[PDB]
Amino acid sequence: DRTPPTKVSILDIAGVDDTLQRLLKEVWFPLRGGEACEKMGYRYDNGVLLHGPSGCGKTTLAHAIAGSIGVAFIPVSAPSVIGGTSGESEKNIRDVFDEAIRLAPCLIFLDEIDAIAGRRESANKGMESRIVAEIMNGMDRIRQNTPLGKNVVVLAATNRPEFLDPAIRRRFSVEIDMGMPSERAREQILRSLTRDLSLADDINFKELAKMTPGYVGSDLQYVVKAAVSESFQANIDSLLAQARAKHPADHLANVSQPQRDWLLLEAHRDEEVSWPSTKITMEQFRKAVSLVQPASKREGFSTIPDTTWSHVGALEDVRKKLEMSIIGPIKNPELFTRVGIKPAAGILLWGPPGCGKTLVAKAVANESKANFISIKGPELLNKYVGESERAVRQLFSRAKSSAPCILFFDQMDALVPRRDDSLSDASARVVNTLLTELDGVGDRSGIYVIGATNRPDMIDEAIRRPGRLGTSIYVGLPSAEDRVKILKTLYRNTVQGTTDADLEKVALDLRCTGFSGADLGNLMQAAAQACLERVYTQRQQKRKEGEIEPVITMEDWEKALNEVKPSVKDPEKYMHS
Ligand X SMILES: Nc1ncnc2c1ncn2[C@@H]1O[C@H](COP(=O)(O)OP(=O)(O)OP(=O)(O)O)[C@@H](O)[C@H]1O
Q: Is there binding between residue 476 and a second copy (CB under 8 A)?
A: no
57 binds, among a second copy, ligand X, none (CB under 5 to 8 A by kind): ligand X
CB nearer ligand X, residue 239 or residue 289: 289
The span from the CA of 136 to the CA of 336, in Å, is 52
CB nearer ligand X, residue 14 or residue 370: 14
> Backbone breaks in the chain (C–N > 2.5 Å) follow which residues?
495, 546
Q: Known binder of ligand: residue 170?
A: yes
Q: Which of 422, 479, 496, 577 binds a second copy (CB under 8 A)?
A: 422
- Residue pair 113/158 in contact (Cβ under 8 Å)? The answer is yes
Q: Is there binding between residue 420 and a second copy (CB under 8 A)?
A: yes
Phi, psi for residue 5 in degrees, rounded to 5: -80, 170
Residue 438 DSSP symbol: H
Q: Known binder of ligand: residue 143?
A: yes
Q: Is the backbone of residue 451 left (phi > 0), alpha (psi -120 to 50) or beta?
A: beta
- Residue pair 66/6 in contact (Cβ under 8 Å)? The answer is no
The span from the CA of 80 to the CA of 94, in Å, is 14
Strand partners, 474: 350
Q: Which of 88, 317, 500, 555 binds a second copy (CB under 8 A)?
A: 88
- CA-based Rg of the chain, rounded to a whole angstrom? 32
- Residue pair 51/177 in contact (Cβ under 8 Å)? The answer is yes
Phi, psi for residue 169 in degrees, rounded to 5: -60, -25
CB nearer ligand X, residue 128 or residue 410: 410
189 binds, among ligand X, a second copy, none (CB under 5 to 8 A by kind): ligand X
**Count of CB atoms situated within 10 Å of the CB of 111:** 19
Q: Is there binding between residue 16 and ligand X (CB under 6 A)?
A: yes
58 binds, among ligand X, a second copy, none (CB under 5 to 8 A by kind): ligand X
CB nearer ligand X, residue 239 or residue 415: 415
Q: Is there binding between residue 186 and ligand X (CB under 6 A)?
A: no
Site string for a second copy, 537-566 (x = CB under 8 A): -------------x-x--------------
Helix ranges, 421-514 (H): 428-440, 480-492, 503-507
Q: Which of 312, 403, 463, 561 binds ligand X (CB under 6 A)?
A: 312
The span from the CA of 447 to the CA of 306, in Å, is 21
CB nearer ligand X, residue 274 or residue 303: 303
| Positions 32 through 51 that interact with a second copy (CB under 8 A) | 32-33, 35-36, 39-42, 44, 46
Q: Known binder of ligand: residue 85?
A: no
Q: Known binder of ligand: residue 111?
A: yes
Residue 33 DSSP symbol: T
Helix ranges, 269-405 (H): 282-291, 316-322, 328-331, 333-339, 357-368, 388-401
Q: Known binder of ligand: residue 221?
A: yes
Strand partners, 154: 47, 108
Determine the interface stretch with a second copy among 99-107, 110-118, 308-316, 497-505 (rule: CB under 8 A): 110-118
Whole-number minimum distance, CB 210 to a second copy, in Å?
15
Identify the helix (H) or strand (E) that includes residue 228. Answer: helix 217-246
- Residue pair 137/103 in contact (Cβ under 8 Å)? The answer is no
Q: Known binder of ligand: residue 158?
A: no
Site string for a second copy, 176-205 (x = CB under 8 A): -x-xx-------x--xx---xxx-------
Helix axes 217-246, 282-291, angle to 10 degrees: 110
Q: Is there binding between residue 323 and ligand X (CB under 6 A)?
A: no
Q: How far is CA 366 from CA 272, 298, 376, 518, 526, in A?
A: 45, 20, 17, 20, 29
Determine the interface stretch with ligand X among 369-377, 380-388, 399-407, 515-523 (rule: CB under 6 A): 515-523
Q: Known binder of ligand: residue 140?
A: yes
Whole-number minimum distance, CB 246 to ligand X, in Å?
29
The span from the CA of 225 to the CA of 231, in Å, is 10
Q: Is there binding between residue 261 and a second copy (CB under 8 A)?
A: yes
The span from the CA of 10 to the CA of 63, in Å, is 10
Q: How many residues bind a second copy (CB under 8 A)?
A: 217
Q: Known binder of ligand: residue 517?
A: no
Q: Known binder of ligand: residue 55?
A: yes
CB nearer ligand X, residue 239 or residue 516: 516
| Positions 272 through 331 that interact with a second copy (CB under 8 A) | 272, 275, 277, 292, 294-295, 297-299, 302, 305, 324-325, 328
Determine the interface stretch with a second copy among 202-210, 241-249, 264-272, 282-290 (rule: CB under 8 A): 264-272
Helix axes 183-193, 217-246, angle to 10 degrees: 40
Q: Is there binding between residue 452 and ligand X (CB under 6 A)?
A: yes
Residue 354 DSSP symbol: T
CB nearer a second copy, residue 118 or residue 478: 118
- Residue pair 158/110 in contact (Cβ under 8 Å)? The answer is no
CB nearer ligand X, residue 513 or residue 540: 513
Q: Is there binding between residue 381 and a second copy (CB under 8 A)?
A: yes
**Which amino acid appears at position 572 of this protein?**
E
Residue 280 DSSP symbol: B
328 binds, among a second copy, ligand X, none (CB under 5 to 8 A by kind): a second copy
| Positions 496 through 515 that interact with a second copy (CB under 8 A) | none
| Positions 332 through 371 that interact with ligand X (CB under 6 A) | 353-359
The span from the CA of 299 to the CA of 302, in Å, is 7
Q: Which of 33, 55, 378, 470 binds ligand X (CB under 6 A)?
A: 55
Q: Which residues are annotated as a binding site?
A: 12, 14, 54-60, 111, 140, 143, 159, 170-171, 218, 221, 313, 354-359, 410, 454, 465, 468
